[PDB]
Amino acid sequence: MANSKNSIFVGGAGRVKQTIEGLAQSAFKPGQLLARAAGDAIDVTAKASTTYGNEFLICDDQPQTLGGGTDVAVTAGDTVQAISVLPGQYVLLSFAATQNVTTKGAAVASNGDGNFKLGNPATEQTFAVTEEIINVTTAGTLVLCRAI
C-alpha cells in the first residue's frame, strides 16, 4: 500500500495541531466526529445532519506508548486526546458505507452516527473537501480530506 494511513493528522510539514483534551463516555474509533457535553466529557456527536454551528472536532489517534493506532478503539472513562481542525489542513476522516468519491473537491457533510458522507451543500454544514479518489463500501474507512 503506497498510501499508508497510520496517522490521523497528515496536514503539512509545518502546521501543528490544536488539541482538546477531555474525558470519555464510550469507545469510539479514531477519525470520527465528536461533540463535548456537560461536565468535561467527550463522546460521539449524535446530532442531526442538518444542524449548523458544530465545531470540527475529530478523535486523534492515541499515543504509541498507550496502545493507540488508527484502528484501535479508545478505552472508556479515560482521557481522550482529540483534534480541533483549523481551516486549511488535511485530516483523515472516516466515511459511511455505499458512496464513491469521484472528483477531488466535493463537499463533506456529517452523518448522524459520527461518520461523514457526501451530502448536498445546501441543507447541511460543510466541514471539509475530498482529496482522494477512492470508493468505499465498509463503514469505517479512512479517506483524506482538506478541512477548508
Partner 1 sequence: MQRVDEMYRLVDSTGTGEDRDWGNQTLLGRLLSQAQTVSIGKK
Closer to partner 1 by CB, 66 or 133: give it: 66
Contact present, 139 and 114 (Cβ < 8 Å): no
Angle at CA 54, nearest 5°, toward 20 and 133? Answer: 90
Mask for 80-119, x = binds a copy of itself (CB under 8 A): ----x-xxx-------------xxxx-x------------
Residue in this structure with the C-alpha cell 492515541, named with its chain if needed: 62
Task: Give the whole-angstrom CA distance, residue 76 versus residue 102.
Answer: 37
- Pick from 66, 97, 133, 139: which binds partner 1 (CB under 8 A)? 66
Closer to partner 1 by CB, 68 or 112: give it: 68
Does residue 67 interact with partner 1 by CB under 8 A? yes
Number of helical (H) and strand (E) elements in the chain, helices listed first: 0, 12
The identity of residue 140, as a single letter, is G
Smallest distance from the beta carbon of 64 to partner 1, in angstroms?
Answer: 6
Does residue 63 interact with partner 1 by CB under 8 A? yes
Q: How far apart are the first and last CA of the chain?
A: 27
Mask for 6-35, x = binds partner 1 (CB under 8 A): ------------------------------
Torsions phi, psi of 144, nearest 5?
A: -70, 135
Site for a copy of itself in 6-45 (CB under 8 A): 18, 35-38, 40
Tell me which residues touch partner 1 (CB under 8 A). Answer: 63-67
